[PDB]
Every structure is written in C-alpha cells, then in structure tokens.
C-alpha cells in the first residue's frame, strides 16, 4: 500500500524515498541515508577533510580526530 | 522579464493569463505542513533536466 | 506622489479610480505588434503643447 513518501518500506517497517536518502537527516534504522545517493556532503556549517569526509565545522580542533583522516586536528589552524 | 542594469536598463512584457493553480481539490495559497502527499507535477529546479 | 529622499522623504495620495482604460473595441494589455490603426488621444509627451 502507499505511505507518506508514496515509495518503499524499510525493514523496520516504516516507509522511506531515495530523494530523502539524501536530504542529509536520517529516515530509517535500516539502511537509507548513510548508502550512496547524490548529496551536498558538507553544508555552509561543516568543514572538508582532505580524504573527501564532511564534518561540522565546530568540531575542528575541539581535540578529536573526528573525520577518519584527522584533518580536523591538524596544528594548521589549531 | 526586466534587465535593472541601470547602465542597460530595459525590461520586456507579454500577455499570459498566470493565475494561481492548485493540484488537489480545494484552493489554498501555500502548501500546508500536514495532508495528503497527491500526486502533482512541478519544474524541476535541476537545470541539466531537458523538458 | 512622492519625494525619495530618506530624511526628507514625503508623499500625497488622492482617490482616483484610474482604471486601466483601452481605445477600440478589445481589451488590451498592451498595444499588440500590430492591428488596425484607429483614432486615439495621448497626453503628448512634450512641454510646450497646452491643455
Ligand atoms: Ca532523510
Ligand atoms: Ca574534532
């Protein structure tokens, strides 16, 4: 049957869409928004990583590498 | 359409009856939050889309 | 009417039902590219002539 997104159900059986898969807020438990769709990874508000990561700027050198490839850390602008 | 250059300031006008429209059955003049998802058509904003 | 200047800014307004007016016997917009020349009055544009 349809549901509020007139598109498929997630196995926790709640109803989901591919253009909300990448409105960058999470619909579903169970797959959904963290596998690959076409996205604006960081907004005004984050921060590049140099190994491609996004990561809300204010977590720059608050003290944890907190993208995978620490550039948030480095001693550049900390 | 109007171009406010100032420098090149022109501007240009046809006639077209736009009128407000609504899909669904009943007028309102913005979307509300909560109802019923129907079916409707829009412009896509994505300029690479070909109509 | 009115004087754009901020500080010294001011306006007057009168009730005048200036409805949009059409010579012939269609309703127009605008003048359209071409059609037949009829009989018409203008405010003319130039100073010197008088009323
Ligand atoms: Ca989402
Ligand atoms: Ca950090």
Redesign the pocket.
Known sequence: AKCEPSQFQCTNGRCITLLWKCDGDEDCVDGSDEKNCVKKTCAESDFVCNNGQCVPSR????????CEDGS??SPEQC | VSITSGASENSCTVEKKIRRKFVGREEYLFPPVQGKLVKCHVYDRLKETSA
């Open positions: 977590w720059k050198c608050d003290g944890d590498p907190d948030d850390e």
